[PDB]
Each structure stands twice: as C-alpha cells, then as structure tokens.
Design a protein around this ligand. Sequence first.
Ligand SMILES: Nc1ncnc2c1ncn2[C@@H]1O[C@H](COP(=O)(O)OP(=O)(O)O)[C@@H](O)[C@H]1O
Ligand SMILES: Nc1ncnc2c1ncn2[C@@H]1O[C@H](COP(=O)(O)OP(=O)(O)O)[C@@H](O)[C@H]1O
Lengths: 70, 444, 48, 370, 355
Amino acid sequence: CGKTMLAKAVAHHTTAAFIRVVGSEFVQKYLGEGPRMVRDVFRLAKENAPAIIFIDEIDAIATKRFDAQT
Amino acid sequence: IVKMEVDYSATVDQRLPECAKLAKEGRLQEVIETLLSLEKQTRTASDMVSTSRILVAVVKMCYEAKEWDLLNENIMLLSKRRSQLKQAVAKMVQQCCTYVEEITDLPIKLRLIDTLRMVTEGKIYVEIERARLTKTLATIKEQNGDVKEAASILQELQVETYGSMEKKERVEFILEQMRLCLAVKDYIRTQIISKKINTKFFQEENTEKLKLKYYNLMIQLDQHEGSYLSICKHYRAIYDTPCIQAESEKWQQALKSVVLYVILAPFDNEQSDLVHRISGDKKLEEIPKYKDLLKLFTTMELMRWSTLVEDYGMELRKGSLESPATDVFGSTEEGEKRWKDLKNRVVEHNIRIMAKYYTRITMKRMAQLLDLSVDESEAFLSNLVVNKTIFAKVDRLAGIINFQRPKDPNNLLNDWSQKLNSLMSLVNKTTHLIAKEEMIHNLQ
Amino acid sequence: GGDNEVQRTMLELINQLDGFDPRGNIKVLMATNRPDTLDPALMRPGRL
Amino acid sequence: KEIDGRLKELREQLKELTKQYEKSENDLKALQSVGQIVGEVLKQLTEEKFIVKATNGPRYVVGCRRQLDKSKLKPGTRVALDMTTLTIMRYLPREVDPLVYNMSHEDPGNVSYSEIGGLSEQIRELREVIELPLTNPELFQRVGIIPPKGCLLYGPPGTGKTLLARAVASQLDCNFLKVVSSSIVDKYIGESARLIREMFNYARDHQPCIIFMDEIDAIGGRRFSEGTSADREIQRTLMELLNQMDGFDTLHRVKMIMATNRPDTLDPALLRPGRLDRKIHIDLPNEQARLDILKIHAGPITKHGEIDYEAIVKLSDGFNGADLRNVCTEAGMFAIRADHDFVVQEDFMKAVRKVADSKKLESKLDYKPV
Amino acid sequence: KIMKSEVLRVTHELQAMKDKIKENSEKIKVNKTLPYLVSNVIELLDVDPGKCAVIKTSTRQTYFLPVIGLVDAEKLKPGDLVGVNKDSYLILETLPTEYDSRVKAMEVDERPTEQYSDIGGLDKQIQELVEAIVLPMNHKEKFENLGIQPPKGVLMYGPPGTGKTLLARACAAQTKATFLKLAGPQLVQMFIGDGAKLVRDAFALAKEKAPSIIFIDELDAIGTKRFDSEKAGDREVQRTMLELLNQLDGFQPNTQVKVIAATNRVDILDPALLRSGRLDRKIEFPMPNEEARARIMQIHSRKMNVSPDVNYEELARCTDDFNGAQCKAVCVEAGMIALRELTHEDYMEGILEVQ
Ligand SMILES: Nc1ncnc2c1ncn2[C@@H]1O[C@H](COP(=O)(O)OP(=O)(O)O)[C@@H](O)[C@H]1O
Ligand SMILES: Nc1ncnc2c1ncn2[C@@H]1O[C@H](COP(=O)(O)OP(=O)(O)O)[C@@H](O)[C@H]1O
C-alpha cells in the first residue's frame, strides 16, 4: 500500500505539513542533539497546527526490544 | 557451432564434378536432388565446409545453365529447408552477390529482391549484412533513383550502422542514401537521418571527398525551410577543407558563401561571435566580400539595401567567381526568397542599431530608413518586440516610439550617488596628482 | 562461535608452554579427570 | 678545458639537489603554521552567520570577514576554522575515500579482454551495458528509456571473472572503482556505512564510474536466526547499501558489476529486478575454448610441431583455464627435468594425466545454477 | 673561463642548502620525536587552484593540513599510524601500522632453527618443493633473468605426522627469510569478517617483512568441498576462502611471500584454490615405508646415546602404518623408559599408549 501514500496524501487532502523524519538517519553521531532535534521538529509541528509527523524505519534500528543493547 | 560427425569431403570431391558434367546444361533435376540428399547427410553430420561447397556448386550450376526462375525457388528451398548451416547460407548469398552484379538483364531486380527476402528473415548483424547492403545499393542503381527504393535504403541502414560499420564503406553508404532522400525531397526524415549520423565525426581529418559531400547534400536540406545560422557554420566547415587542399576556385567561392551567409543570419550573440571571428582573416582581404563584411558587420551603419545593391551588390552581376552569389541571389524563385531574406535582415539590423542610438525617432524617418511605409515599419517593430529583442514602446495615435526603460527613482538616485562618488574619487586623485606635480615643479 | 575465547586461550597458552628453546628449569603439569583435551593432544607428545 | 669541464660536474650534482633551503623553510613554515580546525557548515544562520559542525566537537558558528565568497559556501561545505581567528580564512572542497582510492587506482598492467576465449557473449554483454549507454544516448533517447544498472556473474570458481574485472579496470584505469567487499569491517562501530556513502558520493561526483565489488555473499546472507551483534551489523549495512543504491535517489551513469560463488544463499531482496537488471552465468569452458586457452597459455613455450592438442581436448574435460596453465606449468618443470631446452608432447601427456589424477579426488566441482 | 666562480657558489650553495634542512629536520624531527595524533587519513586530492589530507586525531579532533606539507602521498598512502604534528597539526612521517591485534604476533616465529637433515623419507617430494619455494628465494634473480615467474601456492596434503610443519619451517630457515604460521582450524571466527581481516593483515605483515612463508594449516578446514547441505553450507567460511583467493595475486609482481597450505585430504577442496596462479603445487605426503620410518626415528634418537648398535630392523617390522610423529613418539618413549627394553624392544608400546 506504499505506507507513505497516505502521509503524502491526507496532508494535501486537508492542507497540512508533512515530515519524513526518517528513523535510520536519526540514529547517528547526533545522539546528543537527538533530543534537541525532536524538540525542534515538535516545535515546527506545534507552529503549524495542520501538520503530521511521519517516522520511517523504526523496526530495524529504532529501539528494538528483543536484542540486547549493543 | 556444432561438432562435425561424419565428413564427406571424399564423396563430394569424387562426385560433384561428375554431377556437373552429367548436368552441364542443367536439364536434370535428379542431380540437384541427390546433392540435396548428400548435403542433408552432411548437415545431419554437422559438417559446414561440405554443405557450403554443395550450395556454391548448386548456384554455380544455375549460373552456367541460366535458369533464372528455377534458381529463385531453388535458393528459396535451400534457405528455407531447415535453415541449414549459417556459415553455408552466408557463403551461398556471397557468391550470389558476386554473380548478380555482372549480368545486367531485366529480372536481376527479381534476383536482388529474392535474395533480400531470403536474408530479411533475420540474421542480419550475424552472418553477413554487407551483402544485403550491396543488394539494396544494387537495387538503387537498377531503378535509377526513385522514392520507393530510397525509402527502402533509408529503413535498412540503421541495423548494420549500429552493429558493424566501416569507417569508409558504411559512411559512403550513408552518403549514398541521403542524396536519394534529398532527391525524394523529404525533409523531416532526411533531417533525422542526417542528425543521427553526423554525431559520428573525428574521421573527417582524413577526408578526401566525404565531409564535403556530406555537407553539400545537407546544405539544401537546411536552407530549404528556414536555416541560416547552421548554414554559415558548415559553409565555414567546408571552408577549412581547402586550407589543407589549396584549390583557389572552391576556396574563394566558399569564402564568398560563408561571408554572405554569416551576415545574412538573424542577429544573436553567437552570430556576433562568428562575424568577429571571421573578420580579420588574412586570406579574406583579396575579395570584395572583405569590403562587404567590414561595412555590414559593425559600427552601426545605415544599411540602406537600396544603396547596398549597387555599393556592394556587384557580386550578383559580376565578381571574381560569382558562383556562390548566383546560387544565393541569382536564382529566380529561391533567389528572390533570399533577396527578401536580405531585405528584411537589414531591416531588423537597422532597427537594432537605431535602438542603441536614437531614443525617440519620428515615424516618417524610421519608415524611410527601413525603406517601407508606416504600417510595414510598425509590423516589423511588433515582430521584434514579440521576440523580446528590443525594449520598445510606441504611441500609435502619435506615431512616436521610445527605447529607454522608465528609470525607477530608487536606482535613479543610486546612479546619481555613484556619479557623486566618481566625482569624489576624481577629486582625490586630482588633488594628489596636482599637489605632487606642484612639489616637483617648485623644486627650484 | 560457541566457545571461541576458549580457542583464543588455547592459541596463546600453546605459544607460552611451547618451550621454544628446551629448558630443564621450569616444569608444567596438567591434571584433569577425563582425557578431554583438544587437537594439541597429538602435538603434546612432543610437548606434554 | 680544465676550467671548463670541472664546472660541468659541480652544478649538475645539484640542480634537483641544493633544493633544501626552501624545503627547510616550508617545513619551518609548517612549524609556525597555524593548524585550522575543520568542520562542515550545517546551515547558514544569516548572510554573515554560518552554522558549522566540527567533525568531532560541537557546532560552532563563524563568519566570513570581507572576501571569503559567502555565496559559494553551502550547507554541508567544508571550511577551515580557528578557535582564535574567529572566522573562515579559506574554503576546501571534499574527500575521496583514500583507502578505497589507492586500492581502486592500483590496477596492475593486464592484457586485453580479447586474450580470454569462449566468453565473447559475455564480452558483448559488457559492451552493451557500459559503452553503449554513454556513446549513443540519442538512440536510447528515441527509445525513451533508462539504461540498465548492473549485471551479475556466477558459476564455477574458475571462469575468468577476475581477468574480466581486471581487463575492464585496465580499460579506463582512471574512473574505475574496485571494491573487495570485506574491508567494511573495522574496530569501531562507525566508518562502516560512512565509507559506503562516501564512494557513492564519489560516484555522484564522476558520472562514468564503473563500480566492481566481489563476493556479495560476504554481505548478503539469507536470514539470521538468533542474530549476533556482528550479524546485526551486516543487516543494517546491507539495508544501508540497498537504500543508497536503489533507495529514493538513484545513480546516473553508474553501473555495478558483481560476482560470487553461491547464488542460492543471496538475499532475494537484492536480486530482484530493478537492482540487478541482468543475471549472467559463466558456464564451463568449451572444448574448443579450452583449446584456445591452452594455445594462449602455451604461446611463449619452446616447442615443435608435434603436439596432439586434440588428445589434450579429449582427455582434459571439465577443466577451467586455471587447470590449463597448470598443465602448461607441469610441462615446464618436466622440461626442466633432464635439462631439455624444448617441451615435448610427452611432457604435456604427463601433465594431463597428473592433473587428471589430481582432479579425480575432488567432488562437487561446481554449484548447480539457479 | 667560468668554473671557479660557479663552484665557489655551488659547493657553498650545496653545503648551506643541506645544513638548513639539518636545522629544519631537527626542528621538525623533535616534533617528529613528539607526535601524538593518529593519522586516519581521509584524503582529498586537492589540486591547488596538488593534494591534501584530513587527520582524525587521537584526542578526537580533525586537522586539514594543506597539501600534506611534509610527506608525499605516494608513500603516505591512507590508513593509520603515520606521524602527525602535535603542535603544527601536519603529517610528520610514516611509521609501522597496527597488525590487527591477533595478527601482530599470532604464532609468528621470528626465525626457525629446524634443519632439513632431521627430516626425510619423502626426499623426492621435499626436494621438489624446495626447487619450487626455496630456490625462488635464494636464486630469485635466476627466475627474474629467465623470465618465468615462480609459482607461489604449494599445497602439501597427507595424513598427519608426515613432517609438513617441520619441512615448511626448515624451508623457511633455508631461505633465511620471515616465516609466518597460520592456525587454520581456528580461523573460523564468529565475528563477521574477522577471519577475512586476520588473513589480510597476515598477508600485509608478510609483504612488509621480507619474502615470507605463509604456512596456512588445515586447508580442508578452511575450504569445504562444496558438498552443500542445510546442516552447514560453508556460508560464513566462503567469506574467508575467497578472501584468501584475492590475496594470492597480491604478490604476483616481484614474486615474494609464498603460500604453503597443509592438509590431510586434498579432495575436500573445490576447484577454487587448485588454480595455476593460486595453489598449484600439490605434493603427496604418504606414510613412510619401513626403511623411511626406521631412518626417521634413528635420526630422532641420534641425540640419544644409551643403547649402542640398534639397527632398528625389528622396529621397522613393528612400525606398520605409523607416521613420522608416531616414530618420534616411539623413539622418545624409549627416551623416557631407557633409564638405569633399552635395545630393540623399548619401542613397541609407544603406539599402544595412544589408544
Ligand atoms: N577463460 C580463460 N581464459 C584464459 N585464462 C583463464 C580462463 N579462465 C581461467 N584462466 C586462468 O585462471 C587465472 C585467473 O583466475 P580466474 O579464473 O579469473 O579467477 P575467477 O574465476 O575467480 O575470476 C589466470 O591465471 C588465467 O590464466
Ligand atoms: N620426516 C620426519 N622427520 C622428523 N620428524 C618428523 C617427520 N615426519 C613427522 N615428524 C614428526 O611429526 C611431528 C609433526 O606432526 P604434524 O605437523 O601434525 O604432522 P603433519 O605435518 O603430517 O600434519 C613433528 O613433531 C615431528 O617430530
């Protein structure tokens, strides 16, 4: 189903901001500013009430729970 | 392709010449059939040289006994039986190619198309394609130049040109089909084939009569509809060929053509680059086109074509060679079209040079300068502005024009301030200069 | 990959108790309950 | 002449020599040279304010003073900073993956690709995947299609894949990138996908890059059950590779040539059409192809006109060109034995039977094709 | 004419020229005597509008020394462990790199001392591989002038106890060059690319240290016969196998560092390593006959003088299907019991003890 054709749409069906976020890119050396960027993107979302946050690729990298912390 | 099983070289050697004697005039077909059985046996034995020799012998027997019709269905059966060996059929076509070219006859055109049908079943790039190219060229010569065969040679060349070409044979074949295409006077397809082949250059550094022939067939194609800038570019591309082969007549007439064309081309920045590059040539001075180029290129002179037809129009009547000039302007129909193309070309040139010189010019004077009436002058003036070439605004009721953009007060005071700062800098430089020269002049 | 640190210890221990130059100064004794030694059990006829 | 010729000696000793005082100054210049810290400008705060990340430390902001051409500086550009001079004193372009650079720019002097026989179909496959898209884009423009991306080679371990890869590398020797697909592992957790993005960026810089990497099975895998931290590093490395070659942004004029030995264990996600446009199996060398390879390998060999090449063809079967230089070698020191200047046909027969008896032992000489 | 003016400049301009680098070198060699930052070269071929470099320092910093002001990038190839200025933040000088922890010294013997005389039985085979390995070391120039590049891959297959390890070390001692031993059965590492990384730095160490002898043991363990079952498909070991394959051609020019692979059954290998440019010299290592076994144990017991006049003929009769290792164990078993048997009868029990 694409899994993003509803996020690319809807944001235009009702005019709203759309952000790709990309979880794979987020996990990087910018772990210290990771909290800060979440604050910044949330502020961007809060700035425009018509907005939607879309985060991708959570399963493989972003906080898997069965494999020990490496 | 496949390994040989059972050779019959001894069998064919001891029997084939005897079979030829038994059917010297070819009245017997049992001899043809028994060699078909023999070559079938070698084909099932996967032997190539024996099958090829049998096929060559079979066609040779048909040549000597001159059965043209029986040859047609015989080669059809041979090429369609099971497709045999690709080496053998490629051979058989080759001696067929060697034979059809020596006997003129009426039905050789049928022989040419028959082999074409036998080879057009596929297997073009693989197993000999030059034979099909030669047959198509042979058909061109037989029909003496028409539209159907010119289309046929148009639709054939692409496969072998892309697959396996020759730096001389293939390009000559391309040159020998575009001339027929231009003879057909098709322009869209001839332009397409010309632009898809001219990408293959860097062989013309050793051309004898190939680059010039290519260009002299695509001169007419371009100039037929609207081309005038590409015309000057490849007329100078045929001008640099007599540079390495110094022959005076073609060299000088090429100079006359390129100089006339480069000026005649519509105004643009690139054309300005070409005319400036062309000007100053040491070898260009000895022709009247040198005076024509020097006058009509720069310094914004009034190009009154009524005066130019006698001041610099002598190339129409009599010059050094006047052969390109008669081709351009001495012609009746296309010549008068190019005469009108000179007539307007100097009108936009006169409008353009007037644009950078005169802000407001009265309608009568501009029409007189353009050698036309008021309505014709305004029509061309509209033709320039719709192309964004000039910044012109006209009051049609008053018949007055302006070429200066309305100066916004922001930048108007900016240039005034820049003028002020230029004066301020001049004061600083003059003060230092006079005071120091004052110091030198009172060292007494 | 099950017991590979064991193999890391095996390589270095052989490098240590190989003796290199024979010397009657130091002695080594290995005591187990079952002869479950690894492949060096055939190199040890020259060493142990 | 004594006052003439004694001169011509002494100045030549120098020239290239006596080139030290300035080398001394240059390294002294280095001695008092300021070392300017290096970062990447994340974004431009204002026209004079630029947010720059130190490669290790925090993001600073700096500002060009008078003439550093702030317009040409872009978010992600490389500039030199100093914790003291407060500004950018000069700007610097990028990097090129040096370790990869030399191992991809040290292709040894090879022979032409025509020196290997029986693979003319593979040769023309390489031509119509590499040469054709760049030489004649007008035909494909009339076609209106994108050129294919990559081709796969697989088969017995002895085919000529290394020779073909080295031959195509020697064809260009300037814009060819060689990858061995095993130096990806390192001591640190990082520098695994960072390098992968880096020569992809290098492939973005130069359009006609030909990328060759071998043993995709060294990163591929099928599926890791109870994966280890090292197994988990493959799958994220494989996923990063997949999303950087196909991903959302594709490459242009960049073709990937890869080879392996186990096609079945390859991950099905990579081998789907779109990432691997063509799959080519390099089969067993033909008997006449083996004959041509034997002649190639026996070119500079002192021998007369009695060699029964057909006998070698009949006996030697299933033997790659690898086994053929063995036979050529084995005839070599058979000729060394008894000190024979030439090579006799009996030496080749001894080589053939010794290699044949050598090959008897090993079974499963080739994986079945997919 | 014009000499005496030229050289009074030249010799002066020669000596003063060289003295200032002597000053400068010192000024930078004390800095080269105090480098502190590793050189993780992230190169740019920054042609001046020649080259340039990025150095990941030890203290987690990066320094872009312009055009690499001291060392040519031809010798300064990328990697790590190349001198960097602690104060000038410039590349200082090349220095030896790190040999991948394990490979730094896994089992590398600096110089083996075992001699060719103490081994025997397979003298035709040992002379064959000496001609193929040792001669390409001592008389390497003979092959260079001849024009034939010597083969490098020698595969020595045979049941254990045939003296492969001694012969490889004895050959290395004869060549008087570096010898590197690889523990083949333990190269199968759970860490990904670990065995591939180990073999690389082993080849790198061998290249950096003389024309070496790469003695890889248990080639059958390294390379499977491709008999693929789902029980084990040799998936992760095919990783390391092709890695060894691509490093076999690394030393083709100048023909140094030979590869000697020891195993028992050559048939357990696919036709990958059995390549003419790769491992090509397969030499059989059979169990020695009665004469050879008796001679081998006699040579082993040559340093033992307890029982005079022991012809070892009964031992040769009783040494049925025994290895050179078994013969050594038989002789040293006498070396353990011959205190205070003794002659022609203290030898049989050695084989009986092992099982
Ligand atoms: N088709 C072939 N033609 C000529 N030589 C070959 C051929 N196949 C293998 N060889 C020989 O094998 C060696 C190259 O190894 P190669 O088979 O290319 O490795 P891989 O198959 O892993 O790419 C060369 O010494 C070469 O002489
Ligand atoms: N020809 C020989 N001369 C002397 N000792 C030998 C000989 N052959 C084998 N040995 C003994 O065998 C041992 C080597 O065993 P190993 O290397 O495991 O056998 P292989 O090399 O056949 O695998 C050495 O300790 C040595 O004493």
